[PDB]
Amino acid sequence: QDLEFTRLPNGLVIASLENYAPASRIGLFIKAGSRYENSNNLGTSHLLRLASSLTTKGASSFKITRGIEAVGGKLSVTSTRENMAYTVECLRDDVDILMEFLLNVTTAPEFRRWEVAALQPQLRIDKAVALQNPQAHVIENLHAAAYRNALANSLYCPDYRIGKVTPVELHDYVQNHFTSARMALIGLGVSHPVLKQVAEQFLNIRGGAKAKYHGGEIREQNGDSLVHAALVAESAAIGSAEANAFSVLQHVLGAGPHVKRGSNATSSLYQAVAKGVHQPFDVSAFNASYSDSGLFGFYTISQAASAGDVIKAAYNQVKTIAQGNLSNPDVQAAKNKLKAGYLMSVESSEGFLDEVGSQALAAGSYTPPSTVLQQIDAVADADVINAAKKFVSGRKSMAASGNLGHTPFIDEL
Amino acid sequence: QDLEFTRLPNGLVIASLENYAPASRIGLFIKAGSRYENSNNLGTSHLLRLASSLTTKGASSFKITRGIEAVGGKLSVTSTRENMAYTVECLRDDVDILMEFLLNVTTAPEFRRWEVAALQPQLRIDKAVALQNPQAHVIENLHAAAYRNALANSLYCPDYRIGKVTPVELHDYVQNHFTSARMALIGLGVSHPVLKQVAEQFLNIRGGAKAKYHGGEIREQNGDSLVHAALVAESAAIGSAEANAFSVLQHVLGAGPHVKRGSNATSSLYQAVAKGVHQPFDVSAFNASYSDSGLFGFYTISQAASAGDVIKAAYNQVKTIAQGNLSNPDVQAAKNKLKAGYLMSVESSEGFLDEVGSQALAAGSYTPPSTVLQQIDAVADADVINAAKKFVSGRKSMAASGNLGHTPFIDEL
Amino acid sequence: AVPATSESPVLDLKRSVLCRESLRGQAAGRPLVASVSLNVPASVRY
Amino acid sequence: AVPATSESPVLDLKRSVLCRESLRGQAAGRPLVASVSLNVPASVRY
Amino acid sequence: RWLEGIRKWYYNAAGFNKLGLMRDDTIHENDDVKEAIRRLPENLYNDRVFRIKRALDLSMRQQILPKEQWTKYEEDKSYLEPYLKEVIRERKEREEWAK
């Protein structure tokens, strides 16, 4: 069985593979990520992510919870910087029950004053939890450092706005962003014709700047014995061919582990850093890629005293790749990793749904896995060296968290 | 009556004017400001400032409070980035009682584990209060942006360190910084010979890097309808002749108000900004000057939407002063302000003590007011234009707090 | 339906790292993702 | 001995500004100073 | 319709209007009403608070307002209805679901 695809005259995408599995995943993907906040409504999308299961027009707050739980189902809301994704799972017989709830949640939420206000403390709980990961500190700062406006926005609501996201703001955000022109309705274990008909009858809702890279640095001084740090330069927009080159460069340098408790013998960065410094550490290439822009670099985790040595060692490794020290066996291995990584990411029906929806928003239609692998192979050794060269000469953005006494500045590097 | 002066072989300065007033102020000035913290003991000097009146060797925590209050006295601790100043006031008959307490507080504090721990929450109270002033946010950020290390330190203890400043750290800070080579003992309404003898017998205590300017920017997004903002470049070290030029330039541009509810007709900046934008605002030249370095620029307070216009208007005004648009009547008026401002600052016996002690640390001895005025007059029109030129072409540091949607970046200016 | 890989508490001291072998995997390689749910515990991604 | 120019509370909403005439004086012109005492309320300076 | 004559009579006989109360101020606070009150916007709540304060103060003195100040029958808005109706409608849904 293979995927079906429709783009309606109103802009909306329907894509669905009927695979006759017992479970059915449906996802409504919306261009409504953190990037579409401005300085007046910061953290609105964060509250909105928490806010499904508040009362809707066709269903109460109570009914959304009880009705979904009744059939053993799940309703999740997932945000990137660029998209929001509302996902429902269940046993196939109850899809149109979950669908009714999903439509209510996305197309007619009431955002009642007392309910919206009751939800305010949840912003602090959710944020507090997320910011237990030091990766969350650094990546959120990194973007804030790297951009002037859209992508600079954090996924988590700024402290000052907690308790202050209004019902109006939630209504405005939905009314302005949750529209046919910005929506893709994706599904598994459900027929395409019935999805199309739902999208025509219940998801026909009428419509409602570019990310400026800056280059800055943000430094969280906090006295941990470990220093998390990330250094990136402007990369390439997703959809462009150059982006593929960065993805290969990421895997040349080393993009996370393959063996449990392993020493990463093929990772160019890990070995470059491990040559100089033997104490506990981790280093990885970082590659974000967006509609407008992208960030490529590396992330270090090092001892406080060794942060200087680790970052410089990692940066030096990219410089020699940019200078031209790069053989086919490396670029072949890197491709094999990325090729395997992609097919493995669409291996689960969860990740597959995410890629179908993800593509449908950022691009016109579905690119099959076989065509993607061919496009990875299309990256020549020269393209990888150019990506590295771009990084070396590019205006830098940096972020760190830890005891930064020996963490250098951008202009110290 | 005129001032007396002594510098002992051990480095320590004694200066005292016996003026036969009924009140007597004594100040022990120590090179122990926030700058002498490193990344491991941040906020130690803040706790140390809160920590006088904890138990000493010769007097209990109880006795310091009761004994001083008994004679209607006062004990204050004042910190800049470079110095700490321990000051006692009383009626003349009780000077040697307050002196005994002052010596105990500074030369032998016990910093008992239970007392030091009990004091920890006071860091949050004191900080919280101070940070009610938005000037405190911006100036503390401005320095953190402008410097790599010493002067970058905030006077208020970073959140992560509150509850974590140890007794050892307090002992270390005192032992390493509270020394004869770093101390000046200043006084009014007390004889010089008896001060000298106290300093020889009780203040003979044996001894125990340079500020790198960086140029950065820090942006507090907080949704106020007003935006506080400061933009500075590296100035000149206090003690150097160039510093005097900046002080004159400050008063040419406009350094705060002279008339109540007045429109500041002689302030170059205020009129430059008021030409373009008429809604509520304030603008002033900012001039800090330190042993190693200095910051010169301006501070704006503007409506959120008008922040761009106000900062650019203010910056433009300095550019025309740097280009050469500056007459004698302006430079004469500016000198008259600064000359008057200085003599008025030493008008109170509080401010006089502060200048005697302040000079004694940063320089060798006391410069009389008449010599200072002559040095202000020594600033030529050309020196003012050079200071302005230095600011325009200098690497910039910026800080802001507010709804920064229309506040530009450094590289937008 | 299924509980997450990790139960989340606020105000709970965090798990330590003392070696290379436990610290690898942690260096972030792709941008953040955030999920909240009805059934599954909230968690952020690289 | 003498009480300060302003009594300081924590958790107390701050005083508003609605005009030019009350807002002037506020733009910082010199570096911060911090005093704490036994008798006088803590206050920071430009 | 035809009983509107009696409704208007009863209103004045009942006489809560003489204390400057609206009908919904006189509702006995059960669990639903508590929730309805809790959901009122700042303006409607503070009015309620004052009207009652005023009535209680009058009751304390065993006095009434001037006749001009009495709540007119026609001007008695049913301010609590939309909140209370929904509070009840909600609970009945939970009570249904529980069976």
Side-chain angles (χ1 to χ4, degrees), chain A residues 1-19 21-23 26-88 90 93-204 206-211 213-274 276-278 280-413, chain B residues 1-19 21-23 26-88 90 93-204 206-211 213-274 276-278 280-413, chain C residues 1 3-5 7-13 15-43 45-46, chain D residues 1 3-5 7-13 15-43 45-46, chain E residues 1-7 9-71 73-76 78-80 82-99:
Chain A
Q1 274 327 85
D2 64 343
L3 185 82
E4 301 197 59
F5 202 97
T6 295
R7 197 199 72 98
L8 298 171
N10 69 356
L12 192 149
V13 166
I14 297 102
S16 66
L17 163 56
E18 166 63 291
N19 64 19
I26 293 147
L28 181 58
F29 292 75
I30 314 153
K31 289 162 164 175
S34 70
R35 78 169 290 146
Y36 303 113
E37 302 177 346
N38 54 75
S39 70
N40 295 321
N41 64 338
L42 291 173
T44 296
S45 65
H46 181 212
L47 191 60
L48 185 58
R49 164 159 88 260
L50 277 46
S52 54
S53 97
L54 273 68
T55 295
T56 67
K57 287 190 162 144
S60 68
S61 180
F62 184 77
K63 201 201 173 199
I64 292 159
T65 317
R66 292 296 176 105
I68 290 172
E69 275 197 289
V71 302
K74 185 220 286 155
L75 163 66
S76 293
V77 187
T78 312
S79 293
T80 59
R81 269 163 169 83
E82 308 200 288
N83 318 127
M84 271 178 123
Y86 290 74
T87 325
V88 297
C90 59
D93 287 336
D94 306 302
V95 293
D96 54 10
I97 305 154
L98 266 297
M99 176 62 79
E100 198 184 298
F101 286 123
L102 166 64
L103 290 172
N104 272 288
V105 150
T106 50
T107 62
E110 285 196 338
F111 301 125
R112 299 181 169 183
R113 168 180 43 82
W114 51 90
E115 279 174 35
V116 164
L119 186 60
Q120 298 296 316
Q122 197 56 36
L123 291 166
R124 216 178 314 277
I125 298 166
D126 192 65
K127 197 191 183 180
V129 168
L131 299 185
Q132 287 167 29
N133 298 283
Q135 294 84 10
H137 282 283
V138 177
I139 302 302
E140 297 299 279
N141 287 344
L142 181 63
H143 282 78
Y147 293 95
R148 300 193 191 270
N149 61 342
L151 302 171
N153 291 343
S154 176
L155 294 154
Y156 304 103
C157 174
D159 292 320
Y160 84 93
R161 285 276 290 156
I162 303 169
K164 284 174 185 167
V165 184
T166 74
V168 189
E169 277 161 357
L170 290 166
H171 275 291
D172 283 6
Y173 203 90
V174 169
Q175 196 169 299
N176 288 325
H177 304 108
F178 286 35
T179 74
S180 299
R182 298 166 76 82
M183 285 197 283
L185 181 63
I186 316 302
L188 278 77
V190 63
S191 83
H192 194 95
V194 309
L195 260 210
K196 192 197 178 194
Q197 192 169 277
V198 165
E200 287 167 331
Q201 288 165 15
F202 291 105
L203 225 53
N204 169 56
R206 267 108 69 190
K210 281 168 184 168
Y213 183 89
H214 170 231
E217 55 190 320
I218 289 160
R219 301 169 75 79
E220 258 188 27
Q221 176 66 24
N222 71 31
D224 287 332
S225 56
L226 297 182
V227 170
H228 287 234
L231 183 86
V232 318
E234 206 185 358
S235 179
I238 206 138
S240 77
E242 197 191 25
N244 289 17
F246 281 100
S247 306
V248 178
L249 175 64
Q250 193 197 4
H251 289 76
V252 169
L253 286 167
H258 298 249
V259 188
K260 183 168 198 201
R261 299 189 180 92
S263 70
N264 293 331
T266 61
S267 177
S268 170
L269 281 167
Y270 204 87
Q271 292 303 314
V273 175
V277 285
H278 276 84
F281 88 91
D282 178 14
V283 66
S284 203
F286 179 86
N287 192 38
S289 181
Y290 301 109
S291 60
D292 302 68
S293 185
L295 304 174
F296 176 84
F298 60 86
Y299 192 113
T300 75
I301 296 156
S302 41
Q303 301 288 339
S306 307
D309 309 333
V310 174
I311 294 156
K312 283 170 172 170
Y315 190 23
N316 285 347
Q317 193 54 32
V318 194
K319 289 174 174 169
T320 64
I321 302 294
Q323 276 157 21
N325 306 120
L326 174 71
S327 61
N328 249 330
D330 296 298
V331 187
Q332 201 58 43
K335 280 184 196 174
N336 288 336
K337 286 168 184 158
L338 176 59
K339 284 166 86 177
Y342 176 81
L343 303 161
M344 284 176 195
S345 73
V346 304
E347 194 180 290
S348 64
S349 72
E350 194 213 358
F352 176 78
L353 181 88
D354 201 60
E355 184 66 24
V356 178
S358 185
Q359 275 175 35
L361 294 184
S365 79
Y366 176 64
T367 310
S370 60
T371 303
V372 176
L373 304 185
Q374 188 167 2
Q375 281 183 304
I376 293 159
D377 285 304
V379 178
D381 299 327
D383 300 316
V384 175
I385 301 164
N386 284 130
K389 279 191 285 192
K390 196 170 183 188
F391 171 77
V392 173
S393 48
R395 289 265 271 96
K396 299 296 199 295
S397 306
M398 199 195 72
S401 293
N403 182 3
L404 310 182
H406 303 266
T407 313
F409 295 88
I410 291 175
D411 64 322
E412 279 188 1
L413 227 32
Chain B
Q1 274 327 85
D2 64 343
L3 185 82
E4 301 197 59
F5 202 97
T6 295
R7 197 199 72 98
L8 298 171
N10 69 356
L12 192 149
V13 166
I14 297 102
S16 66
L17 163 56
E18 166 63 291
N19 64 19
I26 293 147
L28 181 58
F29 292 75
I30 314 153
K31 289 162 164 175
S34 70
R35 78 169 290 146
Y36 303 113
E37 302 177 346
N38 54 75
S39 70
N40 295 321
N41 64 338
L42 291 173
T44 296
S45 65
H46 181 212
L47 191 60
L48 185 58
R49 164 159 88 260
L50 277 46
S52 54
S53 97
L54 273 68
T55 295
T56 67
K57 287 190 162 144
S60 68
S61 180
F62 184 77
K63 201 201 173 199
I64 292 159
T65 317
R66 292 296 176 105
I68 290 172
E69 275 197 289
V71 302
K74 185 220 286 155
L75 163 66
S76 293
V77 187
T78 312
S79 293
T80 59
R81 269 163 169 83
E82 308 200 288
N83 318 127
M84 271 178 123
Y86 290 74
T87 325
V88 297
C90 59
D93 287 336
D94 306 302
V95 293
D96 54 10
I97 305 154
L98 266 297
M99 176 62 79
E100 198 184 298
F101 286 123
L102 166 64
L103 290 172
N104 272 288
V105 150
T106 50
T107 62
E110 285 196 338
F111 301 125
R112 299 181 169 183
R113 168 180 43 82
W114 51 90
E115 279 174 35
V116 164
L119 186 60
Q120 298 296 316
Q122 197 56 36
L123 291 166
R124 216 178 314 277
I125 298 166
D126 192 65
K127 197 191 183 180
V129 168
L131 299 185
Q132 287 167 29
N133 298 283
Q135 294 84 10
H137 282 283
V138 177
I139 302 302
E140 297 299 279
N141 287 344
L142 181 63
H143 282 78
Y147 293 95
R148 300 193 191 270
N149 61 342
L151 302 171
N153 291 343
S154 176
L155 294 154
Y156 304 103
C157 174
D159 292 320
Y160 84 93
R161 285 276 290 156
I162 303 169
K164 284 174 185 167
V165 184
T166 74
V168 189
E169 277 161 357
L170 290 166
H171 275 291
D172 283 6
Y173 203 90
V174 169
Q175 196 169 299
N176 288 325
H177 304 108
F178 286 35
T179 74
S180 299
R182 298 166 76 82
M183 285 197 283
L185 181 63
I186 316 302
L188 278 77
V190 63
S191 83
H192 194 95
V194 309
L195 260 210
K196 192 197 178 194
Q197 192 169 277
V198 165
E200 287 167 331
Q201 288 165 15
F202 291 105
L203 225 53
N204 169 56
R206 267 108 69 190
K210 281 168 184 168
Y213 183 89
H214 170 230
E217 55 190 320
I218 289 160
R219 301 169 75 79
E220 258 188 27
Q221 176 66 24
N222 71 31
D224 287 332
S225 56
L226 297 182
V227 170
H228 287 234
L231 183 86
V232 318
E234 206 185 358
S235 179
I238 206 138
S240 77
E242 197 191 25
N244 289 17
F246 281 100
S247 306
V248 178
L249 175 64
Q250 193 197 4
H251 289 76
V252 169
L253 286 167
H258 298 249
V259 188
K260 183 168 198 201
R261 299 189 180 92
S263 70
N264 293 331
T266 61
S267 177
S268 170
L269 281 167
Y270 204 87
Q271 292 303 314
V273 175
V277 285
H278 276 84
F281 88 91
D282 178 14
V283 66
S284 203
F286 179 86
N287 192 38
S289 181
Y290 301 109
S291 60
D292 302 68
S293 185
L295 304 174
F296 176 84
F298 60 86
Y299 192 113
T300 75
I301 296 156
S302 41
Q303 301 288 339
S306 307
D309 309 333
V310 174
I311 294 156
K312 283 170 172 170
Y315 190 23
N316 285 347
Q317 193 54 32
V318 194
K319 289 174 174 169
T320 64
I321 302 294
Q323 276 157 21
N325 306 120
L326 174 71
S327 61
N328 249 330
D330 296 298
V331 187
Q332 201 58 43
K335 280 184 196 174
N336 288 336
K337 286 168 184 158
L338 176 59
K339 284 166 86 177
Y342 176 81
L343 303 161
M344 284 176 195
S345 73
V346 304
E347 194 180 290
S348 64
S349 72
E350 194 213 358
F352 176 78
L353 181 88
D354 201 60
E355 184 66 24
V356 178
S358 185
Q359 275 175 35
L361 294 184
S365 79
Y366 176 64
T367 310
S370 60
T371 303
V372 176
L373 304 185
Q374 188 167 2
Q375 281 183 304
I376 293 159
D377 285 304
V379 178
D381 299 327
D383 300 316
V384 175
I385 301 164
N386 284 130
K389 279 191 285 192
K390 196 170 183 188
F391 171 77
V392 173
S393 48
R395 289 265 271 96
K396 299 296 199 295
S397 306
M398 199 195 72
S401 293
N403 182 3
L404 310 182
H406 303 266
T407 313
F409 295 88
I410 291 175
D411 64 322
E412 279 188 1
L413 227 32
Chain C
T5 182
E7 286 284 64
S8 60
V10 193
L11 276 77
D12 196 349
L13 297 183
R15 184 178 177 155
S16 283
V17 273
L18 293 181
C19 58
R20 258 200 203 174
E21 285 92 329
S22 301
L23 203 56
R24 186 53 170 155
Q26 291 282 308
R30 273 176 68 155
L32 288 202
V33 210
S35 299
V36 173
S37 195
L38 276 190
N39 297 43
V40 191
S43 62
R45 293 163 203 249
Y46 95 78
Chain D
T5 182
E7 286 284 64
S8 60
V10 193
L11 276 77
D12 196 349
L13 297 183
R15 184 178 177 155
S16 283
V17 273
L18 293 181
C19 58
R20 258 200 203 174
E21 285 92 329
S22 301
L23 203 56
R24 186 53 170 155
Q26 291 282 308
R30 273 176 68 155
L32 288 202
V33 210
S35 299
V36 173
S37 195
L38 276 190
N39 297 43
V40 191
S43 62
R45 293 163 203 249
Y46 95 78
Chain E
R1 286 217 129 218
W2 333 96
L3 82 163
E4 199 64 29
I6 305 96
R7 289 180 193 277
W9 173 82
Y10 180 87
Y11 190 82
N12 263 299
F16 52 79
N17 63 96
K18 294 164 196 160
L19 309 180
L21 288 163
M22 278 157 172
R23 170 262 255 180
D24 288 336
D25 306 321
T26 69
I27 197 163
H28 162 53
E29 297 196 22
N30 66 27
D31 289 313
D32 290 336
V33 176
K34 264 132 73 102
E35 179 56 26
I37 293 160
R38 207 196 60 85
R39 285 177 185 185
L40 293 161
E42 274 276 7
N43 54 290
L44 278 179
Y45 174 75
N46 290 2
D47 291 351
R48 166 166 227 272
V49 168
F50 183 74
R51 277 200 305 283
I52 292 157
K53 187 126 180 40
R54 182 171 62 176
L56 291 168
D57 160 66
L58 284 160
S59 183
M60 191 214 89
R61 291 201 249 77
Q62 307 284 8
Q63 316 208 101
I64 51 155
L65 293 169
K67 195 172 176 170
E68 319 90 41
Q69 294 186 249
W70 300 356
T71 313
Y73 174 61
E74 292 75 7
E75 295 181 42
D76 194 301
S78 194
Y79 76 88
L80 195 71
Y83 304 97
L84 183 55
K85 204 252 280 290
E86 180 62 12
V87 164
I88 292 160
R89 214 184 77 91
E90 273 166 13
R91 179 181 42 72
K92 275 210 133 76
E93 196 199 37
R94 296 195 302 282
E95 286 176 0
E96 270 265 307
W97 223 269
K99 319 221 144 208

